[PDB]
């Protein structure tokens, strides 16, 4: 009866295939490249051709095939960058065709007034069959839902585009319609509050619809399946993704780049699948890289010792047994060979001087050391031409964790970057200033929160000096082999974001390391983190273990996913934890939101 | 609340319709109202309406930098919007951006000039960017000089990258000109100087560098950098210039250079009989003389 991530995949596959049946005949496929990956999670390429697709084309490639009469456009309908591209795709074969063509566009997830005008002000609105493809969450795992919006971070925090918040809101409301109102909407931060607002608005619009004869049959009552949804704004805690991640999946995302559960290695290069259907990867992904050697050894000598199993046997039937367990002994065999190779590459990566000089800085900054003491180490890294994203993450780390950079050190930093990597990065440093990730200490927007200096400033920033102690962000006495606490994901540093979540879910454990819902017990402490703290109760108007949705507006890291799975195992008795997010984020994606790539050459 | 917005606008309630669309969060309704306002109003009046509301300006601003599918801009819109709001940094960034698309340095510097010209309309607070802009124009110019004189690519590289290329090509006189001009830090410049000479295989002047007393970055960098893909012979020469070192590492450094002999010698000099044993057993009392290792005690 509860929430199952499978119902989202099956529904997604259904709604697409149902639209493909609708296009009678054979098709060519034009898919937005950022959307091709996420589609792969809900349908197979094989399956798409059964339903009559010839070749696959990208909207970004402009080279749409002429072979077929029906051309199918699949792209996100909120994107302005897509509408202009599609209309221009229609006439770019409407004038160099052969037949006349019937054009079809599946908008993800909805048809917008913006679409209907850009398509009209190109003359091609009436020549295109337009339908709506309501994909929202892409279930990447049974406990991980994602909107998969790759520019969601940039758009939300740089462009101030509230589109990510709107989509996220409709997705969560879809869960409510099916499984009941969230008995409690619990959150932290501006955009977390905005989502809670739209959920409140959308709940009232459904009661206004039913009351005013729009029918819709059945009014929404509090869920019996769901305990609460917890919403955290990414901007409340920029430090976690800025840090180099130290889990196995985490280091894969840092070094190789994970996308839509898949990555690339060199045995052009080959694709690896990275989901939890693989037995071995499930036990590996959330584990600190330090003990990945141990974990690989143990499973390697447990494979050859289960090949020692029952091939002695011989009747005729208990070998027919053993032989059927042999595919999985080949799946488990090669699963090991792949990850023993990745681990070997990632190990070499983690041994380089530059890697260690970066981590050294992070570790000092994250521990509360005088940020100034790290200046020479940063200066050298710049002079040793270490990749701009890696340096900028340190710069933002220092800024965000200290309440900004001292004015002298700022100007020095500005000079190094500009002189190190290009004067184009005036723009880059400006963008990081807009992001409020890299600021002078004398700026009003730099100040952390204190109860001391009460007034002055409304957007006061998270106090990492205060919360380091009060939320026990440092645990340098943590077992990586059998982890006792979430800090293991950084080998001594627990993400503030998940600590914040622990203020709601594990109140007693949190006291332990220094039974009401909401923030009760941590009101003061959480006041020291950026933005609104709230606990909106939904009673409507009219038991077993329940599901908890932990939602990240603005992106979540794998380390945070790991720490949440860790808590989920602990709470296995009373709670099923599902993670929702706009996208899976990391330090590099954040800097790319900022880095200007034009070049003066 | 979803087409309760045009209701507000049907009665030509412009600024009010926009506010209700913003409260909705529905980015579609916001575009729709923004689109209505633009067609209806004097542009300057449109800007005033749209600049009072943060989300509105933000979306207006987005559409201006993405109106065919990436790439192309409505740069004209951006300039006027920023001009009527006295947003001078944002206006300057538009011109800087234009400089990065100019195919010749003279035009690129003109855009930088336009860029700078806006910032002197408030001078203070903009000191850094003015200086930064002033620098790039200089660097571009010096790089155009280098290209004609020395016949190689230089225009567009960073200050540091330029020093590197000048040094790797043996033009240390010019590379020192860049350094002095842009006040490149000592520790930065030494790091550059070393890495380039190593790329250059100019073992001769790396050697000539070693002939002075102290280094602002130490000699530890010179060891490792030269050792790696280079001469263990040249590498070894940087011990014992190394001030900042840990006990009995001079030994391992001679070892890493493949000089077990001189390692043994260094081992005996430090009164470490144990390392001397390990070094002699490595050879073996007879092999590689070893006697020579043995004669050293």
mmCIF file of N, CA and C in Angstrom, chain A residues 422-477:
data_model
loop_
_atom_site.group_PDB
_atom_site.id
_atom_site.type_symbol
_atom_site.label_atom_id
_atom_site.label_comp_id
_atom_site.label_asym_id
_atom_site.label_seq_id
_atom_site.Cartn_x
_atom_site.Cartn_y
_atom_site.Cartn_z
ATOM 1 N N UNK A 422 43.201 33.195 -16.308
ATOM 2 C CA UNK A 422 42.718 34.108 -17.329
ATOM 3 C C UNK A 422 41.942 35.274 -16.764
ATOM 4 N N UNK A 423 41.966 36.408 -17.455
ATOM 5 C CA UNK A 423 41.225 37.570 -16.968
ATOM 6 C C UNK A 423 39.725 37.447 -17.263
ATOM 7 N N UNK A 424 39.357 36.465 -18.088
ATOM 8 C CA UNK A 424 37.956 36.147 -18.314
ATOM 9 C C UNK A 424 37.271 35.851 -16.996
ATOM 10 N N UNK A 425 38.051 35.389 -16.025
ATOM 11 C CA UNK A 425 37.502 34.906 -14.769
ATOM 12 C C UNK A 425 37.140 36.045 -13.835
ATOM 13 N N UNK A 426 37.139 37.256 -14.380
ATOM 14 C CA UNK A 426 36.477 38.362 -13.721
ATOM 15 C C UNK A 426 35.024 37.972 -13.593
ATOM 16 N N UNK A 427 34.474 37.490 -14.708
ATOM 17 C CA UNK A 427 33.099 37.021 -14.772
ATOM 18 C C UNK A 427 32.848 35.857 -13.812
ATOM 19 N N UNK A 428 33.771 34.898 -13.796
ATOM 20 C CA UNK A 428 33.671 33.756 -12.902
ATOM 21 C C UNK A 428 33.581 34.181 -11.439
ATOM 22 N N UNK A 429 34.492 35.053 -11.023
ATOM 23 C CA UNK A 429 34.538 35.532 -9.641
ATOM 24 C C UNK A 429 33.302 36.354 -9.299
ATOM 25 N N UNK A 430 32.780 37.069 -10.292
ATOM 26 C CA UNK A 430 31.520 37.781 -10.142
ATOM 27 C C UNK A 430 30.368 36.800 -9.917
ATOM 28 N N UNK A 431 30.305 35.742 -10.726
ATOM 29 C CA UNK A 431 29.253 34.734 -10.583
ATOM 30 C C UNK A 431 29.273 34.067 -9.200
ATOM 31 N N UNK A 432 30.471 33.757 -8.697
ATOM 32 C CA UNK A 432 30.604 33.164 -7.372
ATOM 33 C C UNK A 432 30.195 34.173 -6.306
ATOM 34 N N UNK A 433 30.284 35.454 -6.645
ATOM 35 C CA UNK A 433 29.840 36.516 -5.753
ATOM 36 C C UNK A 433 28.308 36.569 -5.742
ATOM 37 N N UNK A 434 27.696 36.462 -6.919
ATOM 38 C CA UNK A 434 26.243 36.361 -7.013
ATOM 39 C C UNK A 434 25.734 35.112 -6.297
ATOM 40 N N UNK A 435 26.454 34.003 -6.456
ATOM 41 C CA UNK A 435 26.111 32.762 -5.771
ATOM 42 C C UNK A 435 26.257 32.912 -4.271
ATOM 43 N N UNK A 436 26.990 33.948 -3.866
ATOM 44 C CA UNK A 436 27.285 34.243 -2.466
ATOM 45 C C UNK A 436 28.071 33.091 -1.860
ATOM 46 N N UNK A 437 28.961 32.520 -2.670
ATOM 47 C CA UNK A 437 29.835 31.426 -2.256
ATOM 48 C C UNK A 437 31.274 31.921 -2.029
ATOM 49 N N UNK A 438 31.557 33.137 -2.483
ATOM 50 C CA UNK A 438 32.901 33.706 -2.455
ATOM 51 C C UNK A 438 32.826 35.222 -2.276
ATOM 52 N N UNK A 439 32.885 35.678 -1.025
ATOM 53 C CA UNK A 439 32.624 37.079 -0.690
ATOM 54 C C UNK A 439 33.642 37.662 0.277
ATOM 55 N N UNK A 440 33.784 38.984 0.261
ATOM 56 C CA UNK A 440 34.604 39.681 1.255
ATOM 57 C C UNK A 440 33.936 39.692 2.628
ATOM 58 N N UNK A 441 34.745 39.624 3.681
ATOM 59 C CA UNK A 441 34.239 39.635 5.047
ATOM 60 C C UNK A 441 33.490 40.915 5.382
ATOM 61 N N UNK A 442 33.816 41.993 4.673
ATOM 62 C CA UNK A 442 33.239 43.307 4.956
ATOM 63 C C UNK A 442 31.900 43.514 4.253
ATOM 64 N N UNK A 443 31.559 42.604 3.352
ATOM 65 C CA UNK A 443 30.233 42.597 2.755
ATOM 66 C C UNK A 443 29.181 42.269 3.807
ATOM 67 N N UNK A 444 28.009 42.899 3.701
ATOM 68 C CA UNK A 444 26.898 42.556 4.595
ATOM 69 C C UNK A 444 26.460 41.094 4.423
ATOM 70 N N UNK A 445 26.481 40.602 3.181
ATOM 71 C CA UNK A 445 26.048 39.242 2.843
ATOM 72 C C UNK A 445 26.991 38.131 3.316
ATOM 73 N N UNK A 446 28.142 38.506 3.867
ATOM 74 C CA UNK A 446 29.117 37.539 4.346
ATOM 75 C C UNK A 446 28.830 37.031 5.765
ATOM 76 N N UNK A 447 28.216 37.869 6.597
ATOM 77 C CA UNK A 447 28.024 37.556 8.017
ATOM 78 C C UNK A 447 27.306 36.248 8.309
ATOM 79 N N UNK A 448 27.890 35.465 9.208
ATOM 80 C CA UNK A 448 27.200 34.322 9.781
ATOM 81 C C UNK A 448 26.188 34.773 10.838
ATOM 82 N N UNK A 449 25.361 33.842 11.293
ATOM 83 C CA UNK A 449 24.300 34.128 12.251
ATOM 84 C C UNK A 449 24.836 34.076 13.681
ATOM 85 N N UNK A 450 24.479 35.070 14.490
ATOM 86 C CA UNK A 450 24.695 35.006 15.932
ATOM 87 C C UNK A 450 23.469 35.536 16.656
ATOM 88 N N UNK A 451 23.252 35.070 17.882
ATOM 89 C CA UNK A 451 22.175 35.608 18.700
ATOM 90 C C UNK A 451 22.722 36.843 19.390
ATOM 91 N N UNK A 452 24.050 36.957 19.362
ATOM 92 C CA UNK A 452 24.774 38.079 19.954
ATOM 93 C C UNK A 452 24.467 39.386 19.208
ATOM 94 N N UNK A 453 25.007 39.517 17.995
ATOM 95 C CA UNK A 453 24.831 40.711 17.180
ATOM 96 C C UNK A 453 23.469 40.777 16.506
ATOM 97 N N UNK A 454 22.448 40.432 17.286
ATOM 98 C CA UNK A 454 21.031 40.362 16.908
ATOM 99 C C UNK A 454 20.542 40.918 15.560
ATOM 100 N N UNK A 455 20.469 42.242 15.434
ATOM 101 C CA UNK A 455 19.916 42.859 14.228
ATOM 102 C C UNK A 455 20.946 43.038 13.115
ATOM 103 N N UNK A 456 20.498 43.619 12.005
ATOM 104 C CA UNK A 456 21.348 43.834 10.847
ATOM 105 C C UNK A 456 21.482 42.613 9.951
ATOM 106 N N UNK A 457 20.939 42.719 8.739
ATOM 107 C CA UNK A 457 20.914 41.627 7.777
ATOM 108 C C UNK A 457 19.799 40.608 7.951
ATOM 109 N N UNK A 458 19.069 40.329 6.857
ATOM 110 C CA UNK A 458 17.975 39.350 6.821
ATOM 111 C C UNK A 458 18.380 37.974 6.267
ATOM 112 N N UNK A 459 19.443 37.952 5.466
ATOM 113 C CA UNK A 459 19.882 36.751 4.762
ATOM 114 C C UNK A 459 21.175 36.257 5.380
ATOM 115 N N UNK A 460 21.285 36.410 6.690
ATOM 116 C CA UNK A 460 22.499 36.031 7.387
ATOM 117 C C UNK A 460 22.826 34.556 7.162
ATOM 118 N N UNK A 461 24.115 34.263 7.033
ATOM 119 C CA UNK A 461 24.556 32.962 6.558
ATOM 120 C C UNK A 461 24.759 31.939 7.670
ATOM 121 N N UNK A 462 24.847 30.673 7.280
ATOM 122 C CA UNK A 462 25.046 29.576 8.222
ATOM 123 C C UNK A 462 26.335 29.717 9.038
ATOM 124 N N UNK A 463 26.211 29.565 10.355
ATOM 125 C CA UNK A 463 27.356 29.657 11.249
ATOM 126 C C UNK A 463 28.080 28.307 11.423
ATOM 127 N N UNK A 464 29.121 28.092 10.619
ATOM 128 C CA UNK A 464 29.893 26.860 10.706
ATOM 129 C C UNK A 464 30.803 26.834 11.929
ATOM 130 N N UNK A 465 31.156 28.010 12.451
ATOM 131 C CA UNK A 465 31.926 28.074 13.697
ATOM 132 C C UNK A 465 31.097 27.609 14.886
ATOM 133 N N UNK A 466 29.833 28.017 14.912
ATOM 134 C CA UNK A 466 28.920 27.606 15.974
ATOM 135 C C UNK A 466 28.466 26.149 15.814
ATOM 136 N N UNK A 467 27.998 25.801 14.620
ATOM 137 C CA UNK A 467 27.384 24.493 14.404
ATOM 138 C C UNK A 467 28.400 23.351 14.369
ATOM 139 N N UNK A 468 29.682 23.685 14.253
ATOM 140 C CA UNK A 468 30.710 22.652 14.273
ATOM 141 C C UNK A 468 30.682 21.971 15.618
ATOM 142 N N UNK A 469 30.552 22.778 16.667
ATOM 143 C CA UNK A 469 30.510 22.263 18.028
ATOM 144 C C UNK A 469 29.122 21.763 18.402
ATOM 145 N N UNK A 470 28.117 22.586 18.135
ATOM 146 C CA UNK A 470 26.753 22.311 18.587
ATOM 147 C C UNK A 470 26.097 21.135 17.878
ATOM 148 N N UNK A 471 26.472 20.885 16.629
ATOM 149 C CA UNK A 471 25.938 19.726 15.915
ATOM 150 C C UNK A 471 27.017 18.661 15.686
ATOM 151 N N UNK A 472 28.148 18.811 16.374
ATOM 152 C CA UNK A 472 29.208 17.801 16.382
ATOM 153 C C UNK A 472 29.607 17.413 14.954
ATOM 154 N N UNK A 473 30.003 18.409 14.175
ATOM 155 C CA UNK A 473 30.386 18.161 12.796
ATOM 156 C C UNK A 473 31.708 17.397 12.701
ATOM 157 N N UNK A 474 32.503 17.418 13.770
ATOM 158 C CA UNK A 474 33.798 16.737 13.762
ATOM 159 C C UNK A 474 33.839 15.485 14.633
ATOM 160 N N UNK A 475 34.151 14.357 14.003
ATOM 161 C CA UNK A 475 34.298 13.070 14.674
ATOM 162 C C UNK A 475 35.564 12.423 14.147
ATOM 163 N N UNK A 476 36.733 12.874 14.588
ATOM 164 C CA UNK A 476 37.971 12.325 14.019
ATOM 165 C C UNK A 476 38.351 10.983 14.649
ATOM 166 N N UNK A 477 37.418 10.415 15.402
ATOM 167 C CA UNK A 477 37.600 9.109 16.013
ATOM 168 C C UNK A 477 36.496 8.174 15.522
#
